[PDB]
Design an enzyme around this catalytic site. Structure first.
Site, PDB file in Angstrom:
ATOM      1  N   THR A 132       0.836  -1.196   0.000  1.00 18.61           N
ATOM      2  CA  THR A 132       0.000   0.000   0.000  1.00 18.61           C
ATOM      3  C   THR A 132       0.877   1.254   0.000  1.00 18.61           C
ATOM      4  O   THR A 132       2.004   1.228   0.496  1.00 18.61           O
ATOM      5  CB  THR A 132      -0.945   0.040   1.216  1.00 18.61           C
ATOM      6  OG1 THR A 132      -0.182  -0.098   2.419  1.00 18.61           O
ATOM      7  CG2 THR A 132      -1.974  -1.077   1.142  1.00 18.61           C
ATOM      8  N   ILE A 133       0.357   2.339  -0.570  1.00 21.52           N
ATOM      9  CA  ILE A 133       1.042   3.628  -0.561  1.00 21.52           C
ATOM     10  C   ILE A 133       0.120   4.727  -0.048  1.00 21.52           C
ATOM     11  O   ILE A 133      -1.094   4.699  -0.292  1.00 21.52           O
ATOM     12  CB  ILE A 133       1.527   4.048  -1.958  1.00 21.52           C
ATOM     13  CG1 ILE A 133       2.033   2.847  -2.753  1.00 21.52           C
ATOM     14  CG2 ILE A 133       2.613   5.111  -1.828  1.00 21.52           C
ATOM     15  CD1 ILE A 133       2.292   3.171  -4.208  1.00 21.52           C
ATOM     16  N   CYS A 143      -2.133  15.045   8.582  1.00 17.46           N
ATOM     17  CA  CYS A 143      -1.558  15.355   9.887  1.00 17.46           C
ATOM     18  C   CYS A 143      -0.114  15.828   9.758  1.00 17.46           C
ATOM     19  O   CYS A 143       0.492  15.698   8.710  1.00 17.46           O
ATOM     20  CB  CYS A 143      -1.612  14.133  10.789  1.00 17.46           C
ATOM     21  SG  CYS A 143      -3.294  13.659  11.181  1.00 17.46           S
ATOM     22  N   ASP A 179      -3.018  -3.024  17.749  1.00 16.53           N
ATOM     23  CA  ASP A 179      -1.712  -2.669  17.150  1.00 16.53           C
ATOM     24  C   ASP A 179      -1.286  -1.235  17.451  1.00 16.53           C
ATOM     25  O   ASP A 179      -0.690  -0.558  16.605  1.00 16.53           O
ATOM     26  CB  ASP A 179      -1.768  -2.872  15.638  1.00 16.53           C
ATOM     27  CG  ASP A 179      -0.399  -2.892  14.993  1.00 16.53           C
ATOM     28  OD1 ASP A 179       0.567  -3.410  15.602  1.00 16.53           O
ATOM     29  OD2 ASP A 179      -0.290  -2.372  13.867  1.00 16.53           O
ATOM     30  N   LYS A 228       0.833   1.743  18.575  1.00 12.68           N
ATOM     31  CA  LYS A 228       2.266   2.003  18.586  1.00 12.68           C
ATOM     32  C   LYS A 228       2.467   3.446  18.109  1.00 12.68           C
ATOM     33  O   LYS A 228       1.560   4.055  17.527  1.00 12.68           O
ATOM     34  CB  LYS A 228       3.024   1.004  17.694  1.00 12.68           C
ATOM     35  CG  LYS A 228       2.536   1.009  16.255  1.00 12.68           C
ATOM     36  CD  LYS A 228       3.310   0.049  15.336  1.00 12.68           C
ATOM     37  CE  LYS A 228       3.288  -1.371  15.829  1.00 12.68           C
ATOM     38  NZ  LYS A 228       3.941  -2.303  14.872  1.00 12.68           N
ATOM     39  N   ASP A 282      -5.374   3.228  12.482  1.00 12.03           N
ATOM     40  CA  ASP A 282      -4.893   1.881  12.186  1.00 12.03           C
ATOM     41  C   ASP A 282      -5.475   0.860  13.162  1.00 12.03           C
ATOM     42  O   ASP A 282      -4.859  -0.174  13.416  1.00 12.03           O
ATOM     43  CB  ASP A 282      -3.363   1.855  12.240  1.00 12.03           C
ATOM     44  CG  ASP A 282      -2.712   1.094  11.087  1.00 12.03           C
ATOM     45  OD1 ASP A 282      -3.391   0.716  10.110  1.00 12.03           O
ATOM     46  OD2 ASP A 282      -1.470   0.928  11.152  1.00 12.03           O
TER      47      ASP A 282
END
Ligand SMILES: CCOC(=O)Nc1cccc2c(Oc3ncccc3-c3ccnc(N[C@H]4CCCNC4)n3)c(C)ccc12
Ligand SMILES: CCOC(=O)Nc1cccc2c(Oc3ncccc3-c3ccnc(N[C@H]4CCCNC4)n3)c(C)ccc12
Lengths: 374, 374
Positions: free
Chosen positions: B22-23, B83, B124, B126, B147
């Site tokens: 993915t980009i 952001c 997840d 982090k 995420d």
């Protein structure tokens, strides 16, 4: 079923209608939305509308804006789908079962307005029809959001009829909305078709506010200032939000405690205490020792019945020593803080308003920062 | 520039990559700046789940705002708020932004608590997926989680030992807390070592000094968040109540409320016994010998130097009578509330943490509701 890019809606589902505009129930990116359709004669203004929505809708009490599309003949603006307008909420039957707190709706409305004012945006047309009430979220919470900003009457400040308005015109409108909400559908300037002429004539009344009920006394004090004919007398939005109208029962008790602490070592001849006792006999009903319950009377002995200062001291004293009080006294007072403070505000409806005004002398002091607007 | 419906971007402006190839580009949506994630056909099923979570979760200010998704012949695109940085970037490269770390962590945890209140487990968390917003019109920058619900070093040990519960996110968050306040360390060590050390239960919080108030307080919380036993980890709402997050004014109000509460407690009762258990160390043998002379003077008298209870009563006494204290005494303490409380916590780094633990006995009492989680 009409589809225009990412916006869709069934023209069957009409939510309302100015200049051929129609609002539909619709869908955008699998979100429920309200979809406003604009006729080509207005496209220039719609792009102004849309720009305003983008810079503004990052406040929870400003309506969330999602998208705009345009086919050959129309422009569509999609915003968050809401449960009701404030007009519907106040006037339609059954919404009363949503059990919304009127003061909280008003706090939310005013927080949204303050946000707009902080962005140098003047609403210019605030009224219950464009205050929207959200669908309940996952936790059952419902909120007010402002819409139709920056763009019959009855809500217009008199100086805007009498080329760039200032923020105080919105404060006049909000004052009328405040009364409209807490009175469940009245308006300071009268019946729907009569309001705007009475505004121009300065003909108002706040008769639904009772002169000897604490809640009404506090509401009146605020609303009279918000709808003042002289705009320079109207408080800013942030100033409105600091008013006791919006204080929790716990904060009201905390104000009474801080006041009492502050004047504990103050000269009875000093400016603060003299201010507090000016017109105080009326506030304590001549002798407050005779307008409290017998069990409290008994438990009360250097306190003067004619002194507001002494009433406050008595309140702070019973609060401070609540745990050691007799079971009968704790029972008559009720629990801390909510029932405790109502014991006193219900019996002395002018106490908080009176004390709030008097203690403006100390409004610059750090201690009273939470209570007054600087 | 590439255009796909409402979403556009210049393929040059790459912000990052990801799994499955993915980009993420810098782009536009409806004249808003956005980050645009491009997903391949071999992932569309996971993206539709991604988008769905975003739709239900992004009302909260500390959850990333999601705007739109578009699809062409070849790809799927997801547009979210653009952001300024990830927390990994913020920590590792910004300091003049003057952001408060505790505030970033408070926001991160409010976002997590939101997700947990919706029965969503992040799984997840982090620094790489905690996003830092661009400054708004009033210069404010906030943390937002992303995420969610979709080497390592941030995974709770029980997750590598079916459907995870919320406590796995508290472990991840505990590590993030330590990472932010330590400016880049991790309780389980260096990047390639962390996840093996997690499995082995090998952590240390060496950046947290044992005789500094702020670190003592931070340690108390973080040790619990990263407990190997998931049942020992507090919930997100519970985390948000910890003294770690209290203003200086709230810290002082806690001390005052505690002193008020124990004023009429017998030394035979559990509260005072709990408060004095291990108190010699808290007061440094004799607190009267660890404060400044002006204050020593003014406390003469009847205070026991070996008593935590008396040190707290001392603090309460001087706070309440502050206005009326000698100038030399008001001088050495500093102004209320901020400098006053620091006078004492700087000198007695264990006082708040100790007092906070001991007074858990009263955590159910209305008075202490601000301070403990129910
Ligand atoms: C610069 C600011 O510009 C704007 O805010 N432009 C607007 C765009 C789209 C809809 C708007 C809008 O929405 C409505 N306008 C007329 C009638 C109903 C609604 C509306 C909006 C959202 N939800 C709902 N729900 C209905 C459900 C059925 C009961 N009544 C509420 N209605 C209002 C007001 C006001 C403004 C709107
Ligand atoms: C159910 C939840 O699913 C999601 O949240 N899906 C996501 C969609 C789109 C972007 C995402 C995303 O964004 C990024 N992913 C990789 C690299 C950069 C960014 C990103 C996003 C927003 N702004 C920025 N700004 C850049 C500016 C340049 C400096 N670094 C930050 N980057 C992250 C993380 C995590 C998740 C993303």
């Amino acid at each position: 079923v009409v589809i225009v890019g990412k916006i869709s809606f069934c023209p069957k589902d009409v939510l309302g209608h100015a200049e051929g505009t129609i609002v539909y129930r619709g869908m955008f990116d699998n979100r429920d939305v309200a979809v406003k359709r604009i006729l080509p004669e207005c496209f220039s203004f719609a792009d102004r509308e849309v720009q305003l929505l983008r810079e503004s809708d990052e406040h929870p009490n400003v309506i969330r804006y999602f998208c705009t599309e345009k086919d050959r003949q129309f422009q569509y603006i999609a915003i968050e789908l809401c449960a009701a307008t404030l007009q519907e909420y106040v006037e339609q039957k059954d919404f009363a079962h949503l059990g919304l707190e009127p003061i909280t709706l008003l706090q939310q409305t005013t927080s949204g307005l303050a946000h707009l004012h902080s962005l140098n945006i003047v609403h210019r047309d605030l009224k219950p029809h464009n205050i929207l009430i959200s669908m309940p979220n996952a936790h059952g919470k419902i909120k007010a959001m402002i819409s139709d900003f920056g763009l019959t009457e009855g809500w217009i400040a008199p100086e805007m009829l009498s080329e760039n308005p200032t923020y105080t015109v919105d404060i006049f409108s909000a004052g009328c909305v405040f009364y409209y909400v807490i009175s469940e559908g009245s308006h300071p300037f009268g019946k729907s078709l009569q309001r705007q002429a009475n505004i121009l004539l300065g003909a108002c009344s706040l008769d639904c506010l009772h002169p000897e009920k604490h809640e009404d006394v506090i509401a009146r004090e605020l609303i009279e200032k918000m709808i003042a004919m002289d705009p320079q007398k109207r408080p800013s939005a942030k100033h409105v939000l600091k008013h006791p109208f919006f204080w929790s029962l716990e904060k009201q008790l905390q104000f009474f405690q801080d006041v009492s602490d502050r004047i504990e070592k103050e000269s009875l001849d000093g400016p603060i205490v003299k201010q507090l006792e000016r017109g105080g006999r009326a506030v304590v009903k001549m002798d407050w020792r005779e307008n409290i319950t017998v069990p409290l009377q008994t438990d009360l002995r250097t306190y003067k019945g004619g002194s507001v200062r002494d009433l406050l001291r008595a309140m702070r004293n019973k609060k401070h020593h609540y745990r050691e009080l007799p079971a009968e006294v704790r029972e008559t007072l009720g629990s801390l803080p909510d029932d405790f403070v109502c014991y006193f505000t219900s019996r002395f409806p002018h106490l908080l308003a009176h004390t709030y005004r008097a203690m403006e002398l100390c409004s610059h002091e750090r201690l009273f920062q939470p209570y007054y607007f600087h």
